[PDB]
Design a protein around this ligand. Structure first.
Ligand SMILES: CC(=O)N[C@H]1[C@H](O[C@@H]2[C@@H](O)[C@H](O)O[C@H](CO)[C@@H]2O)O[C@H](CO)[C@@H](O[C@@H]2O[C@H](CO[C@]3(C(=O)O)C[C@H](O)[C@@H](NC(C)=O)[C@H]([C@H](O)[C@H](O)CO)O3)[C@H](O)[C@H](O)[C@H]2O)[C@@H]1O
Ligand SMILES: CC(=O)N[C@H]1[C@H](O[C@@H]2[C@@H](O)[C@H](O)O[C@H](CO)[C@@H]2O)O[C@H](CO)[C@@H](O[C@@H]2O[C@H](CO[C@]3(C(=O)O)C[C@H](O)[C@@H](NC(C)=O)[C@H]([C@H](O)[C@H](O)CO)O3)[C@H](O)[C@H](O)[C@H]2O)[C@@H]1O
Ligand SMILES: CC(=O)N[C@H]1[C@H](O[C@@H]2[C@@H](O)[C@H](O)O[C@H](CO)[C@@H]2O)O[C@H](CO)[C@@H](O[C@@H]2O[C@H](CO[C@]3(C(=O)O)C[C@H](O)[C@@H](NC(C)=O)[C@H]([C@H](O)[C@H](O)CO)O3)[C@H](O)[C@H](O)[C@H]2O)[C@@H]1O
Ligand SMILES: *[C@@H]1O[C@H](CO)[C@@H](O)[C@H](O)[C@H]1NC(C)=O
Ligand SMILES: *[C@@H]1O[C@H](CO)[C@@H](O)[C@H](O)[C@H]1NC(C)=O
Ligand SMILES: *[C@@H]1O[C@H](CO)[C@@H](O)[C@H](O)[C@H]1NC(C)=O
Ligand SMILES: *[C@@H]1O[C@H](CO)[C@@H](O)[C@H](O)[C@H]1NC(C)=O
Ligand SMILES: *[C@@H]1O[C@H](CO)[C@@H](O)[C@H](O)[C@H]1NC(C)=O
Ligand SMILES: *[C@@H]1O[C@H](CO)[C@@H](O)[C@H](O)[C@H]1NC(C)=O
Ligand SMILES: *[C@@H]1O[C@H](CO)[C@@H](O)[C@H](O)[C@H]1NC(C)=O
Ligand SMILES: *[C@@H]1O[C@H](CO)[C@@H](O)[C@H](O)[C@H]1NC(C)=O
Lengths: 488, 488, 488
């Protein structure tokens, strides 16, 4: 009769990494990194994005004639824009604090267009100006949200306007100033020189003067238009005054819905899907903690690390080979992790130990949960745009994002390596503990063989083996008989 | 004669958390997180703070008539401000580079006010102007550190002033420009249209032009006052020139004491107490590495982490139970950690090993220390203000702070969770090593029992027990009797 | 006949730090931190640096007469600039966006000077102005790269100029505006009052007006000169228009080479020496991965920490003392780490176990390589310059750099401590496993002496001792012989 102690081996070829060894085959493993996407830009939480197309943010807000599908847009979740949009300010010029406007848009989910200053109130001026830069079907045209005020007859009276914010929320207002090419066109348009444009609120004052100078021709014109914007608060008033060179607003953008949004720079097209996380390359449909697809991401998403493989060992080391546990593992054990093999006059067979296997199972489950359920609250790494005169700020942003990402990559990798090593040591210690427990309970009644086996000095029936398996072995009951067999 | 090897158990009911298990009851534990404060604002290192009350920095430095208690201010440790102060600028207007000034004030601990331009030197201008926005007992008044130059008779000559910095430190100078509402106001106040204000130092050049427009009424006036500040160096001269619309300074602020300070945004009041670390919720009196009261602290403070519990283990696992360490721990060996129980003819009592307990004690103490004093901090008077045109910078600062705090929280949790398991394995490994050493030194003269206890073959008195315990058991002397008793 | 299991010791005196104890002596150790430099400024990868001497970047780029050796500079790898340069703007004034220009220069490795506007094409003006603040041997002189335009007779026509970038790369163009001291000197230099300077490109448009005021005298003058710079793109045109107070450019700086360079604030001089890493204190020549010389480095460089020492344990714990591993190591086993000492009738000597020694060697080497090669990202800590109106941004940069620095230092120190502790535990576990293996194989034919050695009951020559050393021991062959003496 004999009883021997061993562990479980199977046909798995999964491999994990430790701090002392590389490419170690294990019975079970868990991958906590996601490396695949569907390659599609699709809807997030039911609300589709805002597909700008060839438009730009300024082109959409100002009302570019070639951008007219966005004159009334519903609620969105994120704004899809191209790297170098082709429909933009058609009239050459600039747009002050453009990146601040984009940052503000990164937290707005719906706009409502309110006619604050109608086009028919300017009864002392001409409001039908246009340029061949923003041409519609050949004939000249202009932006569809702005009014170009021009002299009516040989007179340009002082243009005055005002609006009180009785809409319910904060409003966004954009106006412009025209810089001509020569004095002749300034006289032919506004009839007066030394003009000014004044915009005023309770917290804002601004006065601008046109500047006339020959400039390199962009889009065929040497003139420019400079645009500015403001955020009018509730129950506040905005005042416009101008003696010339004013591009007045006709509409204002009320912030209806607010939340966490963003601007995604892609060249793709929206496709009918649904997801909870979105990256420029594609969407992510997972429950795993980590991913390595793309740093930029909108929505609740797994964290990002620059790694190729992050695999946690949850099973024993696969060393296929009766002897026991020192020689190698067993392929016949299909019930648990650690167990016994018994051979007596009534037969032979394998069996598993419930207590130790369960203790190790909960231990490994707790370890996996602790790694996953604490490695959350990582960084965000969301988009942000900077101008050509803010290079130091852009470098600071890049360095900060890169440093945090590197730190988290290091943390995850070292954690996984150390826990894999400790798990393997844990399993070895558990097998040794079972062997030592059985040896201590059996004492001198048996003989060790050196392979993890025990050979009895008496007869162990099936109930005797059940007793030794469940730790109720009666040493005196078989002592005296053994005292014969050993001595003979 | 039985010698059993065991470990100490008490009635402690404190729990640690390892990475393989949760809620492990432990004999002795050390909390390294502080969660309590006194809820009061106190003096830092014996120096009382500067209580601004309902006044803001601009109101204090400009001399608002209702902030007249702050005209002479002694040394301070930190400034206390309200979120939305209500004495800021009686005359509506703006303050240029306000956030930069507030950041400069975070490294200044005392100001000394010098008279740089006396009010009576303007012998060709009227210097008794005031507004009803800054009203005292109904009559109009003005800021106490500024002079409003107006016309004396029907003429406004060129106002010229200069000051050479012989005070002995860097000086802070604030001037202002008045923007009226209508042309009639400009004629009535300065008698000339098309005026300028020129301020010049050896580094700073500034020319400003008054601008006249109709504005929404704030505090009952449509006019504005724009204030600017400069930092004049030692032995440098400042020059003011104006043809109108100059609000001249009368006082300068010499930086008398420099140090590490800050601005703390609270709504409370100073109370009679003395502290060394101050948070917006209250003071901290602790000697621990971590805390979770508030991120923004001033003084010598521990590090902030978003962790609810952080408890290190210093003692054994509380497994209560004569047997040995196989069954559990002893509740009656209150002398140390690892020890021996014995039972011979002349007595039955416990004991405690000295060398092993001392080594474990020093190891645990060194581990706790190395965890604690590995963390090196500084004054860390964090806090920065940003304007409404600077939102990308605010987001950058917030993200950097959040990322660093998250990294440190993860580090602390990892360290505690790993060291807890390491210590809990250290203890039972030490117990097993003591058992193995005793067995090896005793050899075959004794009999194992499977519950951590050794039965003796010869009669062992107290001298032999002490020889076993100290490590000088004589196998040759007790050999023959042991063999005779064993062979039977 | 005896065999003993033990390990190896020597006379080394290297010390390491663990997490449970301090100042532990080891047999072998590896220092991974560099603390030495050559105290020299060398040539990076065969390209000598650009030594500005007592010059500033503005002085070099504008043509300061004292900085006449830099009128044609060759390729450079980095720029060397003093902390407080003495030769810079000879004419008092200011440079707009100076720090942005320095940041741009931090990635340019060669410049080419192209004549874009010659000095002989201003046929209607005077182009020989000068000042004594930029004197050359007493006589007045001006910047060598700029032209000062003054009236030819009592007439100042409109100055117009243009340049089309047909060079082949981006160009850098610098112009200036002159702010006089009095109206008399404005009339004696430009003949008209109320002048302007207009500069226009495809993306930039700017108009500036001179200001006339009396200012404190710097370098004997009360007038000032304000300089601005622009980056002209390929196939783009720049236009200059002026009615007075224009300091026109003559040369443009085409960017010939691009790469990774930098600016070093040092007070030294270049010396004939070569390196691949450079710091302001000296050069680094090493293969180790860490150093604690200076945060700011240029070239292929190691990583930087704030630690005083970092030593990795690649050997055993040195405990000198025939008995085995219970009492300590051996000094006669100079062949490997673990081994056996044997004593029979025909001799007695030491030996080594190749399998366990090789396994430990591989594990230690893999751990060390993992520690070294996982530090691949780290940080870089570039140098940036900020003006005195950007103190918040400067503090943000400093705080971020410091935070990352202590994060990485903490990581390195904790990793070293934990690796040292694990190595010293694993070395003892290996010897214990070897002893257990030999004991289990030899079974009951031997007696244990309690000090790591075994005494054979039978007689065993070298054949059987190399049989037990290589794990091939025949228990039945000596079973009866051992039983004969054991039962006696
Ligand atoms: C309205 C118009 O056709 N203007 C053209 C101008 O006209 C004269 C007319 O105004 C006057 O009463 O009588 C004389 C004859 O006695 C002329 O008939 O003549 C210019 C040439 O000398 C044309 O100049 C060219 O304009 C180009 C751009 O045209 C547009 C544009 O598409 O941008 C046409 C718009 O109608 C015009 N006006 C408005 C109110 O939008 C704008 C406007 O001039 C721009 O703001 C210019 O900065 O320009 C090119 O600029 C070309 O270089 C230029 O020679 C006028 O079109
Ligand atoms: C000194 C005074 O009371 N001036 C008021 C002005 O009176 C004239 C007189 O000075 C002139 O010689 O002759 C004319 C008649 O031809 C007047 O009799 O009359 C104005 C209206 O017609 C007043 O207008 C109102 O002023 C308000 C402001 O007064 C205060 C203020 O409360 O802030 C205080 C001072 O009276 C005034 N002057 C000075 C030197 O400080 C200042 C100042 O005017 C403004 O604050 C900035 O320009 O303001 C309100 O502004 C109200 O809206 C306005 O109608 C004159 O007060
Ligand atoms: C060319 C010259 O020497 N001009 C001096 C000027 O002379 C006048 C003369 O040019 C004119 O034709 O006739 C009248 C009489 O009808 C004068 O004789 O006289 C000024 C004082 O009366 C001098 O003033 C002093 O200039 C100093 C500066 O000299 C430099 C300098 O070192 O910066 C050099 C040149 O003279 C000049 N550069 C030119 C003209 O291209 C510059 C120029 O003034 C700059 O704009 C400096 O702001 O000045 C000192 O500035 C001293 O403080 C001042 O009194 C004229 O030098
Ligand atoms: C491994 O064995 C399992 C039986 O449990 C079988 O389903 C699986 O296909 C086998 N895989 C390989 C690669 O042999
Ligand atoms: C581990 O496997 C990878 C590929 O599977 C191989 O590139 C690498 O060399 C292997 N390393 C070892 C130590 O076997
Ligand atoms: C704007 O309208 C609100 C009511 O919606 C009113 O209380 C406020 O006085 C108005 N503003 C002005 C300047 O009249
Ligand atoms: C635990 O034992 C100690 C003995 O020193 C005793 O003072 C303490 O009160 C006990 N715990 C409780 C909760 O009573
Ligand atoms: C540990 O105790 C906490 C209460 O402090 C409880 O919420 C948690 O479920 C417990 N966990 C286990 C595994 O008992
Ligand atoms: C200011 O005073 C110092 C002496 O205190 C003197 O050296 C310096 O020249 C003065 N400044 C001017 C512009 O005169
Ligand atoms: C370790 O040795 C160094 C010698 O450089 C000594 O300064 C230090 O105090 C020692 N530490 C301990 C704990 O003995
Ligand atoms: C500048 O030169 C290029 C040829 O290199 C030409 O195509 C372009 O039209 C020129 N620019 C202007 C404004 O003429």
């Amino acid at each position: 009769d004999q009883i021997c102690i061993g562990y479980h081996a199977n046909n798995s070829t999964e491999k994990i990494d430790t701090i002392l060894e590389r490419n170690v085959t294990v019975t079970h493993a868990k991958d906590i990194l996601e490396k695949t996407h569907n390659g599609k830009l699709c809807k997030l939480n039911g609300i589709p994005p805002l597909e700008l197309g060839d438009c730009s943010i300024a082109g959409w807000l100002l009302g570019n004639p070639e951008c007219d599908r966005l004159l009334r847009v519903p609620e969105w979740s994120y704004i899809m824009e191209k790297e170098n949009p082709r429909y933009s300010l058609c009239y050459p010029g600039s747009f002050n604090d453009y990146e601040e406007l984009k940052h503000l848009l990164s937290s707005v989910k719906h706009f409502e267009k309110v006619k604050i200053l109608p086009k028919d109130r300017w009864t002392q001026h001409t409001t039908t100006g246009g340029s061949m830069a923003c041409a519609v079907s050949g004939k000249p045209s202009f932006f569809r949200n702005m009014v170009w005020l021009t002299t009516k007859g040989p007179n340009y009276p002082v243009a005055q306007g005002s609006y009180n914010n009785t809409s319910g929320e904060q409003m966004l207002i954009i106006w412009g100033v025209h810089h001509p090419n020569d004095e002749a066109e300034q006289r032919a348009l506004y009839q007066k020189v030394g003009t000014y444009v004044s915009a005023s609120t309770s917290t804002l004052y601004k006065r601008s003067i046109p500047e006339i100078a020959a400039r390199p021709k962009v889009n065929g014109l040497g003139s420019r238009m400079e645009f500015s914007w403001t955020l009018l608060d509730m129950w506040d008033t905005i005042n416009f005054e101008s003696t010339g060179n004013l591009v007045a607003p006709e509409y204002g953008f009320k912030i209806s819905k607010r939340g966490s949004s963003g601007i995604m720079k892609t060249e793709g097209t929206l496709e009918n899907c649904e997801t909870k996380c979105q990256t420029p390359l594609g969407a992510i449909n997972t429950t795993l903690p980590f991913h390595n697809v793309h740093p930029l991401t909108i929505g609740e998403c797994p964290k990002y690390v620059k790694s190729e493989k992050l695999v946690l060992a949850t099973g024993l080391r696969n060393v296929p080979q009766i002897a026991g546990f020192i020689e190698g593992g067993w392929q016949g054990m299909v019930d648990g992790w650690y167990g016994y093999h018994h051979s007596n006059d009534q037969g032979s067979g394998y069996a598993a130990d419930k207590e130790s296997t369960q203790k190790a199972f909960d231990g490994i489950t707790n370890k996996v949960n602790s790694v996953i359920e604490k490695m959350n609250t990582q960084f965000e790494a969301v988009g942000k745009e900077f101008s050509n005169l803010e290079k130091r700020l852009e470098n600071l942003n890049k360095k900060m994002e890169d440093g945090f990402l590197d730190v988290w990559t290091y943390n995850a990798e070292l954690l996984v390596l150390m826990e894999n090593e400790r798990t393997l040591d844990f399993h070895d210690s558990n097998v040794k503990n079972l062997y030592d427990k059985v040896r201590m309970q059996l004492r001198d009644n048996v003989k060790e063989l050196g392979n993890g086996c025990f050979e009895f000095y008496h007869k162990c029936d099936n109930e005797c083996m059940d007793s030794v398996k469940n730790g109720t072995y009666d040493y005196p009951k078989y002592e005296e008989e053994s005292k014969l067999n050993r001595n003979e």
